[PDB]
Write a protein that holds these residues in place. Sequence first.
Motif, PDB file in Angstrom:
ATOM      1  N   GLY A  79      10.711  55.369 -10.494  1.00  0.00           N
ATOM      2  CA  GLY A  79      10.225  55.864 -11.748  1.00  0.00           C
ATOM      3  C   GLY A  79       9.009  56.520 -11.278  1.00  0.00           C
ATOM      4  N   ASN A  80       8.273  56.316  -9.973  1.00  0.00           N
ATOM      5  CA  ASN A  80       7.229  56.654  -9.524  1.00  0.00           C
ATOM      6  C   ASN A  80       7.486  58.333  -8.898  1.00  0.00           C
ATOM      7  OD1 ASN A  80       6.153  54.438 -10.162  1.00  0.00           O
ATOM      8  ND2 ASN A  80       6.086  53.701  -8.239  1.00  0.00           N
ATOM      9  N   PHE A  81       8.950  58.613  -8.676  1.00  0.00           N
ATOM     10  CA  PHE A  81       9.252  59.773  -8.008  1.00  0.00           C
ATOM     11  C   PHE A  81       8.529  60.931  -8.807  1.00  0.00           C
ATOM     12  CE2 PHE A  81      12.341  63.311  -7.686  1.00  0.00           C
ATOM     13  CZ  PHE A  81      12.020  63.705  -6.514  1.00  0.00           C
ATOM     14  N   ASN A  82       8.671  60.968 -10.499  1.00  0.00           N
ATOM     15  CA  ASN A  82       8.094  61.996 -11.138  1.00  0.00           C
ATOM     16  C   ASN A  82       6.516  62.180 -10.980  1.00  0.00           C
ATOM     17  OD1 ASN A  82      10.576  62.623 -12.339  1.00  0.00           O
ATOM     18  ND2 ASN A  82      10.670  60.521 -13.294  1.00  0.00           N
ATOM     19  N   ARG A  83       5.803  60.932 -10.822  1.00  0.00           N
ATOM     20  CA  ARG A  83       4.144  61.339 -10.494  1.00  0.00           C
ATOM     21  C   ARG A  83       4.382  61.871  -9.228  1.00  0.00           C
ATOM     22  NH1 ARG A  83      -0.745  56.831 -10.127  1.00  0.00           N
ATOM     23  NH2 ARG A  83      -2.253  58.544 -10.050  1.00  0.00           N
ATOM     24  N   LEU A  84       5.028  61.394  -8.218  1.00  0.00           N
ATOM     25  CA  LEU A  84       4.817  62.145  -6.922  1.00  0.00           C
ATOM     26  C   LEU A  84       5.269  63.633  -6.884  1.00  0.00           C
ATOM     27  CD1 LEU A  84       6.797  59.511  -4.708  1.00  0.00           C
ATOM     28  CD2 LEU A  84       4.253  60.222  -4.134  1.00  0.00           C
ATOM     29  N   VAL A  85       5.943  63.954  -7.699  1.00  0.00           N
ATOM     30  CA  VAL A  85       6.607  65.285  -7.917  1.00  0.00           C
ATOM     31  C   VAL A  85       5.209  66.311  -8.598  1.00  0.00           C
ATOM     32  CG1 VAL A  85       8.209  66.840  -8.829  1.00  0.00           C
ATOM     33  CG2 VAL A  85       8.820  64.919  -7.518  1.00  0.00           C
ATOM     34  N   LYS A  86       4.975  65.684  -9.596  1.00  0.00           N
ATOM     35  CA  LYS A  86       3.495  66.105 -10.372  1.00  0.00           C
ATOM     36  C   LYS A  86       2.482  66.470  -9.228  1.00  0.00           C
ATOM     37  CE  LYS A  86       0.015  64.786 -13.244  1.00  0.00           C
ATOM     38  NZ  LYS A  86      -0.421  63.756 -12.758  1.00  0.00           N
ATOM     39  N   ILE A  87       2.215  65.599  -8.613  1.00  0.00           N
ATOM     40  CA  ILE A  87       0.995  65.573  -7.675  1.00  0.00           C
ATOM     41  C   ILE A  87       1.432  66.491  -6.397  1.00  0.00           C
ATOM     42  CG2 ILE A  87      -0.544  64.506  -6.195  1.00  0.00           C
ATOM     43  CD1 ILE A  87       0.246  61.587  -7.768  1.00  0.00           C
ATOM     44  N   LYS A  88       2.722  66.604  -6.008  1.00  0.00           N
ATOM     45  CA  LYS A  88       2.907  67.607  -4.954  1.00  0.00           C
ATOM     46  C   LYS A  88       2.684  68.895  -5.592  1.00  0.00           C
ATOM     47  CE  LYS A  88       5.307  69.838  -1.636  1.00  0.00           C
ATOM     48  NZ  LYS A  88       5.064  69.472  -0.163  1.00  0.00           N
ATOM     49  N   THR A  89       3.217  69.208  -6.893  1.00  0.00           N
ATOM     50  CA  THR A  89       3.106  70.621  -7.287  1.00  0.00           C
ATOM     51  C   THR A  89       1.794  70.979  -7.533  1.00  0.00           C
ATOM     52  OG1 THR A  89       5.271  70.073  -8.242  1.00  0.00           O
ATOM     53  CG2 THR A  89       4.614  71.933  -9.240  1.00  0.00           C
ATOM     54  N   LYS A  90       1.003  70.252  -7.604  1.00  0.00           N
ATOM     55  CA  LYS A  90      -0.480  70.551  -7.709  1.00  0.00           C
ATOM     56  C   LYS A  90      -1.187  70.694  -6.708  1.00  0.00           C
ATOM     57  CE  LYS A  90      -4.145  70.061 -10.791  1.00  0.00           C
ATOM     58  NZ  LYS A  90      -4.746  69.212 -11.908  1.00  0.00           N
ATOM     59  N   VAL A  91      -0.649  70.014  -5.557  1.00  0.00           N
ATOM     60  CA  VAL A  91      -1.687  69.976  -4.316  1.00  0.00           C
ATOM     61  C   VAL A  91      -1.036  70.757  -3.113  1.00  0.00           C
ATOM     62  CG1 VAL A  91      -2.567  67.607  -4.781  1.00  0.00           C
ATOM     63  CG2 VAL A  91      -0.549  67.857  -3.076  1.00  0.00           C
ATOM     64  N   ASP A  92       0.244  70.905  -3.344  1.00  0.00           N
ATOM     65  CA  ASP A  92       0.847  71.900  -2.438  1.00  0.00           C
ATOM     66  C   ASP A  92       2.050  72.629  -3.128  1.00  0.00           C
ATOM     67  OD1 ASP A  92       1.904  72.952   0.070  1.00  0.00           O
ATOM     68  OD2 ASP A  92       2.978  71.229   0.463  1.00  0.00           O
ATOM     69  N   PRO A  93       1.756  73.694  -3.992  1.00  0.00           N
ATOM     70  CA  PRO A  93       2.824  74.307  -4.795  1.00  0.00           C
ATOM     71  C   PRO A  93       3.770  75.134  -3.786  1.00  0.00           C
ATOM     72  CG  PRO A  93       0.506  74.645  -5.477  1.00  0.00           C
ATOM     73  CD  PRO A  93       0.555  74.233  -4.082  1.00  0.00           C
ATOM     74  N   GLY A  94       3.302  75.524  -2.608  1.00  0.00           N
ATOM     75  CA  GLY A  94       4.136  76.407  -2.022  1.00  0.00           C
ATOM     76  C   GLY A  94       4.904  75.640  -1.039  1.00  0.00           C
ATOM     77  N   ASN A  95       4.962  74.322  -1.060  1.00  0.00           N
ATOM     78  CA  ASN A  95       5.713  73.235  -0.125  1.00  0.00           C
ATOM     79  C   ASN A  95       5.530  73.582   1.223  1.00  0.00           C
ATOM     80  OD1 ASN A  95       7.423  71.158   0.417  1.00  0.00           O
ATOM     81  ND2 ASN A  95       9.376  72.404   0.033  1.00  0.00           N
ATOM     82  N   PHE A  96       4.071  73.641   1.795  1.00  0.00           N
ATOM     83  CA  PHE A  96       4.044  73.910   3.105  1.00  0.00           C
ATOM     84  C   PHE A  96       4.546  72.719   3.750  1.00  0.00           C
ATOM     85  CE2 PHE A  96       0.919  72.999   6.657  1.00  0.00           C
ATOM     86  CZ  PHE A  96       1.534  73.814   7.468  1.00  0.00           C
ATOM     87  N   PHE A  97       3.801  71.454   3.119  1.00  0.00           N
ATOM     88  CA  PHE A  97       3.942  70.169   3.811  1.00  0.00           C
ATOM     89  C   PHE A  97       5.524  69.779   3.301  1.00  0.00           C
ATOM     90  CE2 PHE A  97      -0.601  70.391   3.560  1.00  0.00           C
ATOM     91  CZ  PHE A  97      -0.652  70.086   4.988  1.00  0.00           C
ATOM     92  N   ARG A  98       6.548  70.067   4.332  1.00  0.00           N
ATOM     93  CA  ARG A  98       7.734  69.675   3.946  1.00  0.00           C
ATOM     94  C   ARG A  98       8.736  69.171   5.029  1.00  0.00           C
ATOM     95  NH1 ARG A  98       6.909  74.981   5.057  1.00  0.00           N
ATOM     96  NH2 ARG A  98       8.180  76.023   6.600  1.00  0.00           N
TER      97      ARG A  98
END
Length: 502
Positions: free
Chosen positions: A475-494
């Motif tokens: 259930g932590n997957f949702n928080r990771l996804v929220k934080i990823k969307t804020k710190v790297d919205p362009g998904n450079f770190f992939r």
Amino acid sequence: HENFIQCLLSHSQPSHPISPAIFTPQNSSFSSVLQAQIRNLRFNSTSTPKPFLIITALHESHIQAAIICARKHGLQMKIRSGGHDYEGLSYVSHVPFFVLDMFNLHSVDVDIETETAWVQTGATLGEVYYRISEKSKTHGFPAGVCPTVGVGGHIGGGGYGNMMRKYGLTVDNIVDAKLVDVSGRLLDRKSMGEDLFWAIRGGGGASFGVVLAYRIKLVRVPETVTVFQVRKTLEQNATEIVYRWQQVASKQLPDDLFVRLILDVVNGTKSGTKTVRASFLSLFLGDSNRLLSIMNESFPELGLAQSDCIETSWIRSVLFWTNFQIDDPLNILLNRTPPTLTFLKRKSDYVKQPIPKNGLEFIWKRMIELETPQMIFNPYGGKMAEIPSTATPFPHRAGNLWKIQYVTNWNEPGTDAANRYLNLTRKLYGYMTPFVSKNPRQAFFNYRDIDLGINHNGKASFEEAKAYGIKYFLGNFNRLVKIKTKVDPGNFFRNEQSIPVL
Ligand SMILES: *c1c(C)c(C)cc2c1nc1c(=O)[nH]c(=O)nc-1n2C[C@H](O)[C@H](O)[C@H](O)COP(=O)(O)OP(=O)(O)OC[C@H]1O[C@@H](n2cnc3c(N)ncnc32)[C@H](O)[C@@H]1O
Ligand SMILES: CC(=O)N[C@@H]1[C@@H](O)[C@H](O)[C@@H](CO)O[C@H]1O
Ligand SMILES: [Cl-]
Ligand code: NA
Ligand code: NA
């Protein structure tokens, strides 16, 4: 890629020149630099995709350059520290890519006064352990057994070791960190915020940025620790012994006692025949007399005797736990290269209920018929049960008796040979299904398994990422996804198993 190579030189700080850090295949260095941090021979085949360039970062500025340039030039960057990724995701990619190699950033600054240490992500666990032990025989750090593992991936992914029942994970023992973000800002805990500092403590650093350093919290180890390895075959009543291990190793044995169980197939007593060997490998944070009282009361079936116990420093326990001789010189921990490289597959599982004896005898027959797969059972409980599932992206806390690692190694090169061992590994995992967690089938991020799913990082990324992300992070997957969307919205770190944007 010459506009990218030019952007890199263009962004070079004159105090730390980037040119000596850039390797392309036209440098005769390139092959050995790529090969130096390879820890799975599966990903050293001629048919394995090669990066077009390697930056061996020598300074924070080389990371900043590589991030900024790779970003505006839309290039796939793979971050590599110790290169232990079981899937080679640090140095392999199916799109054109370069590797940012962190091994030259390996500073370990031990502060015994504050029981802390600033550890650059390019450092290995062995360098960190060696550097603690040089200042103090009574401090340690609850990280992994493998000395050549890199700090970057190990901590990033929620690293554990044989003191997790006492001290929890690596990620439960971080006071601060330095990270370079998508914008190329050098951030610490304070400037990074608690969201990003949470994410890089078990959520896979490579989804959020280049972690440059962790400030780790050292832990007290006793003046004397005890280790043992006791081996039992099925013919030495291993079923009863394993069965008892299951009831005590996470639930009942004091937090000071870690008893790992390694299950492998060995030659039986009758010639040609095979049996299961159950190896019990232990770190007790205390002396043999207290251990022998614990084991005589809670686990007498092991038949542990004074002659089985080795008493030594915490640092020499590390040597023992990695099959180095206990009287080896400590600086063997500074070797970045393991003595053996193999072809290997890893998977993980979590067990939430003891396997009935009938189920163990089942597993023995399956393991004997597949010969090569081994299983390693790592007991949780103690501190691992006390920390809430939300404390880190790593969610596997209370309710988990133990973590299984599926270990298949081989020497034969080629996909055909690979497919055979992969198949054996997948079959044992298949057989284990009813015994292990379900809905979902939990996995440990650091035991990375691309069989759990591949993120192609297009339209489908969030959908594909759920397939491994819920297994790794529940259930932590949702928080990771929220934080990823804020710190790297362009998904450079992939990467093939990166946290996706919403
Ligand atoms: C024993 C051995 C021999 C191996 C090879 C792996 C082991 C191990 N024992 C372990 C243990 O006792 N406990 C564990 O928790 N894990 C153990 N592992 C697995 C190991 O922890 C993982 O394989 C870990 O990922 C290894 O880290 P590494 O050596 O740094 O590996 P990579 O360089 O392949 O990176 C892995 C992964 O993390 C990203 N990464 C690396 N460095 C990064 C920095 N600085 N910032 C952000 N992200 C970083 C890579 O991109 C890759 O995705
Ligand atoms: C670490 C390792 O085994 N690397 C091998 C290297 O030994 C071999 O000579 C080379 C071809 O020249 O191919 C690499 O994959
Ligand atoms: Cl391993
Ligand atoms: Na090459
Ligand atoms: Na006890």
